Amino acid sequence: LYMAAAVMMGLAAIGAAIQFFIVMGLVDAIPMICVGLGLYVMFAVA
Numbered sequence: 001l002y003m004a005a006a007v008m009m010g011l012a013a014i015g016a017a018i019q020f021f022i023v024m025g026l027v028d029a030i031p032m033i034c035v036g037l038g039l040y041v042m043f044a045v046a
Contacts, residue, residue, distance in 0.1 A: 002042030009039025 013032025
């Protein structure tokens with residue numbers, strides 16, 4: 001359910017995805033990208 005889980009990453013990651021200059025550990029895409037990868041997979045978990 002990457003919708004509420006969208007919140008999971010999407011919040012963290014869309015919060016991240018949506019600065020790596022060095023603030024990436026604070027960005028949250030780290031997941032976004034890999035884990036938003038799988039939070040975005042959280043629903044794209046076919």
